[PDB]
């Protein structure tokens, strides 16, 4: 049903909050790259999907805790969205 | 049934379109590497599988949007193909 819509909203919330909190945790650490919000949002997407481009990573303790929260909630919610799309697709498979 | 065949076709379409659109979005950005179609196709495969070799990544906004579409549709469809192969395998497990 509209559970996928609620999972999508949770995923977006996780991505935005992870971007904001990642920038907040990483600024102040020399060499840190997760320090501007757009690419922190990109990194949140990469984390939720586990796509593994490896172009951005947190180097502080709190940045890595933020990363863990984005992994748990982001991977779970993105898994819910993906499951919903798959079920809808096989639902389309009965047509032909 | 032949749902796996339809999922495979969707995955291939996602990979080709993601390659074409990735090259289209990334050319014009200095330092971009996703600028020729063969390796853009390789990168689309890497994205759909989340294999994480990290040898290629988009650096523009539209290239990252293309990446997100390839993540959603590509990960979903590749998950459908993988599920189909798994079910077929356990189906072979009754033989012995």
């Amino acid at each position, epitope marked *: 049903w509209r559970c996928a819509g609620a999972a999508t909203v949770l995923l977006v919330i996780v991505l935005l909050a992870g971007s*904001y909190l990642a*920038v*907040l945790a*990483e*600024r*102040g*650490a*020399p*060499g*840190a*790259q997760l*320090i*501007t*919000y*757009p690419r922190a949002l990109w990194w949140s997407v990469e984390t939720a999907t586990t796509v593994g481009y490896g172009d951005l990573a947190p180097v502080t303790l709190w940045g890595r805790c933020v990363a863990v929260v984005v992994m748990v909630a982001g991977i779970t919610s993105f898994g819910l969205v993906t499951a919903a799309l798959a079920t809808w697709f096989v639902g389309q498979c009965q047509q032909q | 049934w032949r749902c796996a065949g339809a999922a495979t076709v969707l995955l291939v379409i996602v990979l080709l379109a993601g390659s074409y659109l990735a090259v289209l979005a990334e050319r014009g*950005a*200095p*330092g971009a590497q996703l600028i020729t179609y063969p390796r853009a196709l390789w990168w689309s495969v890497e994205t759909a599988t989340t294999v994480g070799y990290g040898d290629l990544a988009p*650096v523009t906004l539209w290239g990252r949007c293309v990446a997100v579409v390839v993540m959603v549709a590509g990960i979903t469809s590749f998950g459908l193909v993988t599920a189909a192969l798994a079910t077929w395998f356990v189906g072979q497990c009754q033989q012995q």
Partner: antibody
Amino acid sequence: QVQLQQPGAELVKPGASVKLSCKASGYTFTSDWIHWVKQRPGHGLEWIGEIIPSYGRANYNEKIQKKATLTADKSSSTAFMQLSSLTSEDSAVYYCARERGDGYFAVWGAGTTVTVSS
Amino acid sequence: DILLTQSPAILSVSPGERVSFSCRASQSIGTDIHWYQQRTNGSPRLLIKYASESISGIPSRFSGSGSGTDFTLSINSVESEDIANYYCQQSNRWPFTFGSGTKLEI
């Protein structure tokens, strides 16, 4: 409208302290960072530190001695830099700048000329 | 910390010709470089962001180029109002750092 407003000058006795202000106008976001930059006469720009007013965390340049403390008032939309125990090496123009969390300083204040003397 | 080297420190040109400022980073920083102009007694003013993106209100004579470690600020046809100091600035890694600046003289 002048988006960032700073006092023109402050005179500080040696070993004393001063509190510089930077009143902000225009668009305000929680992604906003306020930075402070020091410029000695005939010299270049020197990054001092940053603060995110919508949370209150500040970071400081570690390559130089920490002679500053950053605060912010969300009501008056005003950032403050406290310079403590000043020598004559601290006599300079002090700018504040607004960065929308995307890495560049879109707007700058006019700067506060700080003179340390008796 | 990223060291931004601006050489030469002084640039002397005739009016109307094209001038190029050099900024070189101690390591690769993608396109995360930004350029500022500071006239005598004035505050710095942003000219170019992210190596090449134009800023509203900045004359079209200004452009930027580069990625990785080598970046260039270009003025197509210099006029007297361009006389100032020019600073580059990186945002790729914490902390943000400035170059030492190049003076334009005509």
